[model samples]
Target: MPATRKPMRYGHTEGHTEVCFDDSGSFIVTCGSDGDVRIWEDLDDDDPKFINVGEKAYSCALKSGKLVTAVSNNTIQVHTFPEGVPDGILTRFTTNANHVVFNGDGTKIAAGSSDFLVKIVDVMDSSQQKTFRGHDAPVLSLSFDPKDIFLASASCDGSVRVWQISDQTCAISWPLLQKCNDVINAKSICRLAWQPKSGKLLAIPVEKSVKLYRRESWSHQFDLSDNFISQTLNIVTWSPCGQYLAAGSINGLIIVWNVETKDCMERVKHEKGYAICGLAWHPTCGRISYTDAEGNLGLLENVCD
Candidate 1:
């Protein structure tokens, strides 16, 4: 057995969805399909305040005293701290926005849509600063480098492109493919994660394996796999300090890897019969919180243990 421990379950409802912790780990926000977002002050406490922004929320991100959500009505709404009051609304995309994230200084916002484009907007002006085009399919994920130098977007069309922020030019773009009969064929790029602190490395998952790369040279570092070939990954994220990488799989498992040694630190089986729907680390702690397809929430602490 892999040192299994029980997670303190909180809040039960018809549809429990995505969860995210604020930069200070002081508050956690969870979104449900029932058109509601709940804010909890701490993990051990109950009685969280709830806010319903729209009919549905697809994704959410937190940074710089604001809560940004991609809602169903083709809009990205930004709200202020624990009050959950609307601060600003972004309606640049014609189609439904799928994902949203903030840059290092919280001065910029990046969002992807069903329209197959990545739009970057400055927080001060709320104007579309730059738009990246190349993906033939919907953009699934977006990540900003720690230093605000690059933005990485992954798409269903099987390619990951890194955009140089200063010049608004694509520094490097590559397709996710494997050789077949000496011919390369494309495959879906599931998720992309940049190292938490330095942002010098990039990690992407293709099929059942994870690929690492160096930002400067844009070169491959290593490929990660496991003994069990059946494991399917759903999400990949970095630890708060960038010392480890955590990946949540389809089988209710969370695997943590040592960044420098490329060694497996912990392979924790968190839940059974519940596919992980969301995974996020505390801003400055060893705790990680995740949600499942069944609307379940879990907390893993002292991960290095």
Candidate 2:
């Protein structure tokens, strides 16, 4: 049976650059260049609360009933979930904070910045944990191991580095060009996603391709590329079972692939001339949520009888 897609209109008037769901998949939040962050708990007639950040909210993450937003003003803000109450802000970034991620337990938070740095912070005490350095360019993506053993980061220089959180030491650093023998010299590393279970599987987006890696020795598993036109991939997500991988490209195409068979399960033309901004998978099922540059939100569900 073929999957079904249902489109929803995002709350923002402008394009939503980021979209995410809470750990329970109970609430969905989206932010945009328009400087508004809205939360949706019940899609049926429930009104969403409009959150004003005073600047463009580039990225947002939801964990442990709290909201973390990376804004264009070079700062990260934590707020009370659902109600949008103000908590505190981290203002150490020298450039715009591009992305944010919470560990599996949500006790720690990490934000990647355009200053080429990834800053880790304690969620409760609001203390600065550690600053990871070495990226030659802006840090574009960040993720934590499911067990909270390591943190992974990717930068615009095509470098992916894994750091041991205990001592804040760089455990593994692999540059895509050298690691893959220049198979495809990536211009930048767009995102990093860890499989939810073992965290042993990692997905990284190169210029026009997606690379999967195994955690045992950090060896490359496979390279997935489009046989058609080359479009820059902005985001990737792994299904709850880790059997499927979904990627969204700047050209507004969403591709869902079976990891084992390496076959395309679903290909969606979400929009035209609008870049895909973000993607998220349902916490317990084969449902996916995604947003694009045209301020459109889409939902895909694998319906089986």
Candidate 3:
């Protein structure tokens, strides 16, 4: 059967750069170059409510029932959203932030910046609890271990480093995967994802193909493959279960790869002249969503069986 797509609420931000969904998949938060971060109360509604944070946000996160937005001007804001409310007032603390995340229990928050530092802060008082540093380049992405015991970071110089946050020490670092035949040389390590079940396993796409590796051995593990060559990968993310790696490519191709077998199960084509820039899976629902360079958003419902 052919997959179906339906238009939910259209994003108000013309340059829709990033989108993040709540843990329950009931709410979606988006950010764009328009300098606004809006929350969609219910995507299926005729007129979903939104908010304008008044700053460009590249990323946002929903954790422990709180929403944290990362702004381009080097600041992060925290706020709480009410059910079906258009205006959710921003709370007191606004820190100079780049990437923000809440711990598993939501009792602690972590924020990273371009200055190569990661800070763990107390959620209740927004007080600095701990800080970590090791990367020589601008830190771009980070992911906490599901158990909240470790944190992994990536930087501009193409290095993926893992840190033991509790000890505040660097654990291991791996250089970007080398270039392969017709594989796009990764410009920078944009993001990192840890598998859900095997917490020691991580699936990362440095250049074109997503590579899965074990924490014990930093060797070349699994390389995501495609029948076609020379297409640039735009964005990639691991599914909640870490069973699939979905990537949006420069040539308007969307691919989902099975983690264990390294097999691509789906290949989606987009409109001509349009390339995908962002890829995401619903937090709870199995549907897939993608955004293009032109800020056009589309959803593929019931993407997986």
Tens digit of per-residue lDDT, candidate 2, span 166-263? 78788887886222222123333366798877887788877677888887488989977766425777778888777888888878778888877888
Which scores higher on TM-score, 1 or 3? 1
Query: Clash number for every model?
Result: 0, 0, 0
Provide the global lDDT of candidate 3 against the true structure: 0.62
lDDT of 3 at 60: 63
The TM-scores, one per candidate, come to: 0.88, 0.88, 0.80
Cα misplacement distance, residue 184 of candidate 1 (Å) = 26
Regions more than 4 Å wrong, model 3:
2-16, 41-46, 82-98, 103-105, 177-189, 272-277
225-291 per-residue lDDT for model 1 (tens digits): 7665355676788887888887776666777778788788777775464656577877877777777
lDDT per residue for candidate 3 within 42-100, as digits (tens), equals 44654645556556765566665666666665655666643322323222222334456
Q: For model 1, which pairs clash?
A: none
Q: Superpose all Cα atoms of candidate 1 onto the true structure and report the RMSD in Å to 1 decimal.
A: 4.4
Ranking by lDDT: 2, 1, 3
| Cα-based lDDT for every prediction | 0.73, 0.75, 0.62
TM-score: model 3 vs. ground truth: 0.80
Model 3: per-residue Cα lDDT at residue 17: 57
Residue 82 accuracy (lDDT) in model 3: 32
